[PDB]
Design a binder for this molecule. Structure first.
Ligand SMILES: CCCCCCCCCCCC[N+](C)(C)CCCC(=O)O
Ligand SMILES: CCCCCCCCCCCC[N+](C)(C)CCCC(=O)O
Ligand SMILES: CCCCCCCCCCCC[N+](C)(C)CCCC(=O)O
Lengths: 238, 239
């Protein structure tokens, strides 16, 4: 990967050592990106539920969300592989594995655990690595969601042929999104790319303008909320 | 302008020396790109008639075309400023003045002759010139149609904030379009740009699939045909 600083370098160092799992999947892959496209056709707002017990939430969100985002990074985000595997086997909507993917065995894990795609982060990989890991996931039938954070990220993402892009424009220190830069990046992205905008639930009212801007789906974090129904009702009312 | 070679250099040097005109516009701007979006909303195929007796042709296509393109380049395309004024004073659908625009006075000419927008061509202009002519056209209420011919063109147009793009991908000596590169370029354009594809009338069967790729309108040349009813009926049939 890249040679970074601080906690990002630590989580990169740790992820490079992530032991792979013995596991086998319960169902075939459900394409997250194509389901988003089918939600667009049917004029249903496509929201990836960004989860931070987890089985209860996944059960509730299954009837409403276009897909589920499950954190598996262990040191800084309290995730686990077993959590993912349990969620993936008892739900039948696409599961996105959310982690710091730096080697091919992590894509094996995601696949063997029941995930339907994985997150790739341009800003921690070389261009060579990103194309190699993008093609490795596709070998399993997984179009990964590629996280872009700035213009250079997007240049690389389009050069290697990414079809599934999530736009952050976030400071990896604080965690705040520059909405202005996010809008910019979204507007530079080809229309044959499935575009996902990262939001917090407090900015839920930006959804409609972002749709008109070309956004196909939304990766929505619910901050400190714990009640799936209340999360869902707050999304619904906007 | 950029440095160029062949006939393209010649027409660009001729255009730098194009005398301006002093006419008075006889009706307000009718926005071509918005009318295109109106047609999209109504599921009416939007086609810009690429005219190539012209007043009879214009009066006839006014009922069906989303807009008209009139050539005003004089030496190679047999166009004239006076033909543009007479057509524009006679139909009520948007008019596109198609020329080699390298200076602001030509945009003045378009406005004063009654055109509703202008063509700008990425590959004959520097980036600064193109951004400058873009805003000057916008000073009159003309969102120009920006012509892109390759990926470097498209990169420059999206950076300056082109909202209205026509995709050619044409060998500028022969006039032949690389069809699969035209489709590549179409798909590289963000979804919120109004997209126009150049077509020959013999390619009218590609319209539906081009709509599916995200194309909003079609700049259709009718080749050698001389009967405007036959031209319309040939397109009417293929839908
Ligand atoms: C798998 C999902 C991708 C999103 C992860 C983005 C990372 C940015 C979030 C901020 C993380 C901040 N923490 C918790 C590590 C604190 C570190 C603060 C610091 O830089 O000093
Ligand atoms: C090359 C010159 C192009 C002139 C534009 C001719 C368009 C022909 C359309 C004929 C109108 C037929 N209508 C009345 C049924 C409308 C068609 C509806 C549709 O767009 O499918
Ligand atoms: C006229 C408004 C601009 C539209 C874009 C022009 C593209 C046309 C390209 C085809 C060029 C064909 N020609 C005949 C002009 C070249 C031959 C000139 C010559 O050597 O006689």
């Amino acid at each position: 990967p890249r040679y970074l600083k601080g906690w990002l370098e630590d989580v990169v160092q740790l992820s490079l050592r992530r032991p792979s799992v013995h596991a086998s999947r319960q169902r075939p892959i459900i394409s997250l990106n194509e389901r988003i496209l089918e939600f667009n056709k049917r004029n249903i707002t496509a929201i990836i539920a960004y989860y931070t017990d987890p089985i209860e939430y996944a059960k509730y969100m299954e009837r409403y969300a276009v897909g589920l985002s499950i954190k598996t990074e262990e040191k800084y985000f309290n995730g686990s592989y077993e959590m993912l595997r349990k969620i993936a086997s008892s739900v039948s909507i696409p599961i996105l594995m959310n982690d710091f993917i730096v080697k091919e065995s992590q894509i094996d894990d995601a696949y063997n655990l029941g995930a339907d795609t994985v997150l790739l982060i341009v800003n921690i990989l070389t261009e060579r690595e990103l194309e190699s890991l993008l093609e490795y996931a596709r070998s399993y039938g997984m179009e990964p969601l590629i996280l872009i954070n700035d213009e250079n990220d997007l240049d690389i993402a389009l050069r290697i042929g990414a079809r599934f892009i999530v736009i952050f424009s976030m400071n990896f220190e604080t965690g705040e999104i520059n909405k202005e830069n996010q809008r910019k990046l979204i507007s530079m992205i080809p229309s044959n790319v499935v575009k996902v905008a990262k939001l917090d639930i407090s900015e839920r009212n930006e959804i409609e303008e972002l749709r008109k801007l070309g956004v196909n789906a939304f990766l929505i974090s619910s901050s400190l909320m714990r009640n799936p129904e209340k999360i869902k009702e707050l999304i619904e009312g906007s």
